Amino acid sequence: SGFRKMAFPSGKVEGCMVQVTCGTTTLNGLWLDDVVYCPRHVICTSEDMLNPNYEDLLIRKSNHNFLVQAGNVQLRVIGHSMQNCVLKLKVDTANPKTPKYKFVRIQPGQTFSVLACYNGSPSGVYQCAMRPNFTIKGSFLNGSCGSVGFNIDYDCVSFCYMHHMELPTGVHAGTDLEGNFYGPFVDRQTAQAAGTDTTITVNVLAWLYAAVINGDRWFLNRFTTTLNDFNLVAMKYNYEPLTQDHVDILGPLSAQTGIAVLDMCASLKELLQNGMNGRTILGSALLEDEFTPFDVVRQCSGVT
Amino acid sequence: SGFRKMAFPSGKVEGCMVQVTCGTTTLNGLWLDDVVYCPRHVICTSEDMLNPNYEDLLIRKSNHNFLVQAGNVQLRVIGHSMQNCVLKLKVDTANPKTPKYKFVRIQPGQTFSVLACYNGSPSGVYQCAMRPNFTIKGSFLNGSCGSVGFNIDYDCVSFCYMHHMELPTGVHAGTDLEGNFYGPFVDRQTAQAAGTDTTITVNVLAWLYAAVINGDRWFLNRFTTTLNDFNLVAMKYNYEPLTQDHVDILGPLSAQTGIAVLDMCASLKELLQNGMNGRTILGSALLEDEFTPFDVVRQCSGVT
Numbered sequence: 001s002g003f004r005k006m007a008f009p010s011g012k013v014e015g016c017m018v019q020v021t022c023g024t025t026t027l028n029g030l031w032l033d034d035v036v037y038c039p040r041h042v043i044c045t046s047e048d049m050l051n052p053n054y055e056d057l058l059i060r061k062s063n064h065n066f067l068v069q070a071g072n073v074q075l076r077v078i079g080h081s082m083q084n085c086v087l088k089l090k091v092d093t094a095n096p097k098t099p100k101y102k103f104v105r106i107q108p109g110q111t112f113s114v115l116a117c118y119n120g121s122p123s124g125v126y127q128c129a130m131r132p133n134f135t136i137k138g139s140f141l142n143g144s145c146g147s148v149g150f151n152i153d154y155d156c157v158s159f160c161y162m163h164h165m166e167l168p169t170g171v172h173a174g175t176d177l178e179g180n181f182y183g184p185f186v187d188r189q190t191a192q193a194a195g196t197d198t199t200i201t202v203n204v205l206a207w208l209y210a211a212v213i214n215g216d217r218w219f220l221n222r223f224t225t226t227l228n229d230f231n232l233v234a235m236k237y238n239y240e241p242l243t244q245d246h247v248d249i250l251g252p253l254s255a256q257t258g259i260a261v262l263d264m265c266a267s268l269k270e271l272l273q274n275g276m277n278g279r280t281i282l283g284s285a286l287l288e289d290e291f292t293p294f295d296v297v298r299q300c301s302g303v304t
Numbered sequence: 305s306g307f308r309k310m311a312f313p314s315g316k317v318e319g320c321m322v323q324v325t326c327g328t329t330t331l332n333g334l335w336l337d338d339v340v341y342c343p344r345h346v347i348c349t350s351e352d353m354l355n356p357n358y359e360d361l362l363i364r365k366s367n368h369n370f371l372v373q374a375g376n377v378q379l380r381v382i383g384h385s386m387q388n389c390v391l392k393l394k395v396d397t398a399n400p401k402t403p404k405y406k407f408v409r410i411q412p413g414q415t416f417s418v419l420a421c422y423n424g425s426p427s428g429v430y431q432c433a434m435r436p437n438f439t440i441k442g443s444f445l446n447g448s449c450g451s452v453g454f455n456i457d458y459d460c461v462s463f464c465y466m467h468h469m470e471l472p473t474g475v476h477a478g479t480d481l482e483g484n485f486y487g488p489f490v491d492r493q494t495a496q497a498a499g500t501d502t503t504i505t506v507n508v509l510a511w512l513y514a515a516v517i518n519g520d521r522w523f524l525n526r527f528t529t530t531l532n533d534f535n536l537v538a539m540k541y542n543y544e545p546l547t548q549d550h551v552d553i554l555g556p557l558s559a560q561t562g563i564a565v566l567d568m569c570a571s572l573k574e575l576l577q578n579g580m581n582g583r584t585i586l587g588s589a590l591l592e593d594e595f596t597p598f599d600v601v602r603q604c605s606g607v608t
């Protein structure tokens with residue numbers, strides 16, 4: 001028993017982290033096979049960052065201008081190319097620690113582990129979610145760019161995120177491993193609207209199932225609701241509309257606890273309308289939305 | 305910016321995890337050098353666990369009865385011994401992935417990362433604190449015994465905890481790497497009083513400094529307090545008494561933000577007496593006590 005915001009073990013990813021330096025800028029790179037992936041703003045100076053012409057900036061750079069260091073050993077760069085907002089640096093050596101991996105574009109509401117890195121070295125690992133507005137509420141400082149988000153299935157690391165920037169609002173923006181930003185964000189120092197964020201309804205319900213599994217049951221009630229009535233409440237409280245697909249993904253949790261999804265929705269409805277009344281659920285005084293139904297099942301069953 | 309419950313990167317510890325089987329019981333072991341450390345209840349059966357005579361149970365076991373598997377390879381056991389509540393299995397091979405390490409007995413209120421494991425394989429990593437009552441509020445299931453807690457300083461892994469059991473109250477108990485339980489707990493199936501827990505006052509103040517650093521300042525007020533007046537409030541709310549040593553450890557955070565410790569105590573006092581009023585601090589609706597002042601400095605400065 002017990003429920004924690006658990007991250008995947010970071011070992012397979014620690015072995016891929018490298019430091020990439022170009023000109024005066026140093027950030028993190030991801031070494032998989034003979035390729036190092038890193039944000040393309042590594043080629044910019046502070047003056048360049050207001051409206052950088054990346055194509056022009058990259059033209060002034062040669063393979064020898066990108067300094068890639070893995071721990072203490074220097075990697076030899078034999079090719080460079082830009083794909084969307086990432087640079088792909090071909091190196092003459094395949095990373096001997098390359099795990100089985102995939103590049104995936106996660107959906108908003110999905111979660112992943114982030115290995116925060118500075119100068120190619122890891123500092124910590126934390127679990128987070130891609131917000132409905134495509135930002136991530138992370139913990140990142142200057143030099144953390146190039147840190148990656150990932151998931152792990154048995155032996156395969158699915159890389160889903162690469163950190164690029166912090167918005168003026170303190171939230172974080174980045175790309176998939178093909179360099180496509182999640183959201184409307186561009187890699188330039190300009191005003192950027194993050195957009196209205198909502199609460200991940202299906203995740204809150206999953207976390208309510210995790211609470212029941214771990215003995216926290218005070219919020220269960222004698223009521224039920226319908227998808228339409230629950231969605232009127234979700235609208236009022238900036239919760240994502242719950243769909244039949246969400247109800248279906250909650251099936252395993254509904255089967256394990258014997259609490260129908262719509263009965264759990266009525267608990268969520270009462271909690272939204274009345275609050276916690278000074279009480280807690282799984283050590284939290286607010287409704288947690290950074291656990292997917294899959295995360296709850298994985299943690300409550302002990303999948304390694 | 306941003307503040308997260310961040311764990312240390314788990315790689316150095318993943319490389320030490322092994323599976324230990326004895327009789328019908330399988331749990332996790334920690335392979336450092338030519339020694340595998342694991343909970344001594346690995347030698348018990350379910351009937352034995354009510355009042356096990358460990359010395360007698362271990363006498364019926366030989367080196368060949370302890371099956372130690374590292375990934376997919378079997379380790380040869382050449383010695384076995386019991387030290388307090390841990391078994392030390394000498395193996396004929398030193399772990400090639402043994403990091404630089406120390407065995408440390410952490411103090412209550414200190415934090416550490418836990419690498420939860422099942423059958424010698426890691427499932428996740430989370431940050432937690434040794435509660436003042438010497439329990440840990442973790443996420444552990446059957447088979448997680450032997451999972452370890454640790455801290456990392458540059459290249460040295462300080463092992464501080466080994467998971468042994470779950471109390472009937474759902475909280476977790478375990479030992480240092482010498483087999484000494486933290487707290488009054490014994491490794492037997494009996495009633496065990498966890499004892500009154502308190503809130504780690506110095507950690508809440510550190511987290512209040514982290515909040516100011518990251519823009520959350522709504523709780524700052526026009527008031528100050530004294531150590532004695534603040535401690536009367538801490539008593540009333542089951543908060544640990546704040547001492548001059550705590551004030552001193554908060555010095556770096558006080559220097560960085562320019563907010564005197566006693567002024568921050570007056571903010572904490574007002575928050576304890578009036579609550580959050582439906583607001584949040586660093587995404588939390590309650591006062592967080594699982595970040596030490598050192599954790600705050602490390603995260604806010606990006607130490608790798």
Ligand SMILES: CC(=O)NCc1cc(Cl)cc(CC(=O)Nc2cnccc2C)c1
Pocket residue numbers: 041049140141142143144145164165166167168172186187188189190305
């Ligand atoms: C406001 C802003 O940062 N816009 C321009 C911009 C656009 C890009 Cl592609 C990159 C950067 C640097 C950057 O944001 N780094 C960073 C990352 N995470 C935490 C803290 C920092 C300082 C800056």
Ligand SMILES: CC(=O)NCc1cc(Cl)cc(CC(=O)Nc2cnccc2C)c1
Pocket residue numbers: 001345353444445446447448449468469470471472476490491492493494
């Ligand atoms: C109530 C109780 O567990 N007492 C006896 C006892 C004492 C000891 Cl040394 C060990 C065990 C097993 C045990 O608690 N395992 C476990 C660990 N973490 C999470 C879930 C589980 C089931 C059992």
